[PDB]
Design a binder for this molecule. Structure first.
Ligand SMILES: *[C@@H]1O[C@H](CO[C@H]2O[C@@H](C)[C@@H](O)[C@@H](O)[C@@H]2O)[C@@H](O[C@@H]2O[C@H](CO)[C@@H](O)[C@H](O)[C@H]2NC(C)=O)[C@H](O)[C@H]1NC(C)=O
Ligand SMILES: *[C@@H]1O[C@H](CO)[C@@H](O[C@@H]2O[C@H](CO)[C@@H](O)[C@H](O)[C@H]2NC(C)=O)[C@H](O)[C@H]1NC(C)=O
Length: 224
């Protein structure tokens, strides 16, 4: 992974700087002559400065799938997919096409998407024929009741607004419903179980004390 950042001030800003960026929420991680942006780096760079693995914030793209009770599903499965998309990190899931009759050539495609979403397909066709990273799924000569698999990869270029879209095999009425959601939030430790954090005179936000008015210092220790 790599991480190019510039004077980021928060975990959110860090995570938005690229898919390899991660954030250390460890208390007091910043030395006297360091900006808060030192908390933002690749995972191996943070481990090397002594951030523990569970203090490293790193929201990751995820796919979750659902099948119906499947008296209802025919030729395409799964029927429902939910994607959590961290910008620049593809989420991948497999779609299986299976037909009780002989199928000749199967194309897998999606409806028109906004500029912020990129979709590619790998096609795992019969006879070990495989295509990678194409604009649509494409297999030739499907025998009877033999599944073919398409690997769908979806990447967001920024933190998107939630939306759905569909994937279909051309010539068939089956639908895979794809729900997409952003994956841009850090789930950092908050201060609920310690009134001593930030001297009880600031808010703890992903390892950084945001001091109450009149208080200053990295731990809100100084009063002016
Ligand atoms: C995070 O750092 C704070 C700040 O404490 C300072 O302590 C100095 C001895 C020196 O190392 C300096 O670089 C550092 O920033 C820690 O707070 C201190 O905690 C002690 C008790 O352990 C108190 O007696 C001090 O009053 C208090 N000082 C301040 C300025 O708040 C804090 O413990 C530390 N947190 C963790 C989890 O290590
Ligand atoms: C979708 O299916 C493909 C093919 O079955 C999976 O690719 C295989 O992944 C394993 C690792 O888990 C490798 O050992 C195999 O060599 C891969 N096969 C091929 C043909 O490349 C892929 O992992 C599946 N994707 C998901 C998200 O489950």
């Amino acid at each position: 992974q790599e991480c190019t950042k510039f004077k980021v001030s928060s975990c959110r800003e860090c995570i938005e700087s690229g898919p390899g960026c991660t954030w250390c929420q460890k208390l007091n991680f910043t030395g006297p002559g360091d900006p808060d942006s030192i908390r933002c780096d690749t995972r191996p760079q943070l481990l090397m400065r002594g951030c523990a693995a569970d203090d490293i914030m790193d929201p990751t793209s995820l796919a979750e799938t659902q099948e119906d009770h499947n008296g209802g599903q025919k030729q395409l499965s799964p029927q429902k997919v939910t994607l959590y998309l961290r910008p620049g990190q593809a989420a991948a899931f497999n779609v299986t096409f299976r037909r009780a009759k002989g199928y000749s050539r199967v194309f897998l495609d999606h409806n028109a998407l906004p500029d912020t979403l990129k979709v590619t397909y790998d096609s795992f066709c019969s006879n070990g024929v495989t295509h990678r990273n194409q604009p649509r799924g494409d297999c030739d000569g499907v025998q009877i009741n033999v599944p073919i698999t398409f690997q769908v990869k979806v990447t967001a270029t920024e933190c998107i607004q939630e939306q759905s879209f569909v994937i279909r095999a051309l010539g068939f009425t089956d639908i895979v419903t794809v729900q997409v959601l952003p994956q841009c939030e850090c789930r950092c430790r908050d201060q609920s179980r310690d009134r001593s954090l930030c001297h009880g005179k600031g808010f703890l936000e992903c390892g950084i004390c945001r001091c109450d008015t009149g208080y200053i210092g990295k731990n809100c220790e100084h009063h002016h």
